């Protein structure tokens, strides 16, 4: 029950509510799949931090599927960018490309390969963050300036260390749930 307490204590209510909604979609109980719960919250918060550091970015993640696809289709219709096969996380209006955001407890390159093999689209930019301050991005183009990426890396490390002080990090990292 400690993972749920930590989640509600370190993530703001909006993020927690969105994550619980995602889990209700999956038919998953956040009191049981606690690690997936924390992972969902962390990925949501990274996506929102990313989109706020720009308005440069359009947030697709966190919307219900109806709204997410409505926004994707609006962007495609008004830009001509090819429609992604999977719901991406953001749209970058400056570079004019969709972005998939990855947050992993494994090596950034392994998860990068996983994401790139999955989405199978040369056009969606991919950006992977770890909990150790590492990143990897398509073409090594990290989109953001050093300060914003620093802010995200700090937040992720801090989440890791909070989990560690509560003896939660070990279970969370050995689990691939949420990636
Ligand atoms: N939608 C969605 C989604 N689901 C998992 Br699992 C990992 C992600 O990075 C992501 O954007
Ligand atoms: Mn997503
Ligand atoms: Mn993502």
Author numbering: -1 to 52, 74 to 198
Show me the paper's own sentences about this structure.
Among the most important influenza virus targets is the RNA-dependent RNA polymerase acidic N-terminal (PAN) endonuclease, which is a critical component of the viral replication machinery. The PA subunit, which enables endonucleolytic cleavage, is composed of a C-terminal domain that is mostly structural and an N-terminal domain that is catalytically active.
Among structures, compounds 4, 8, 9, and 10 break with the chelating oxygen triad motif by replacing the carboxylic acid oxygen with a nitrogen atom. Interestingly, several nitrogen-containing isosteres were found to have a bridging water molecule between the nitrogen of the hydroxypyridinone core and a nitrogen from the isosteric groups (see compounds 3, 4, 5, and 9). Compound 9 showed relatively poor inhibition, due to the loss of a strong interaction with Mn2, which cannot be provided by the nitrile isostere in this context.
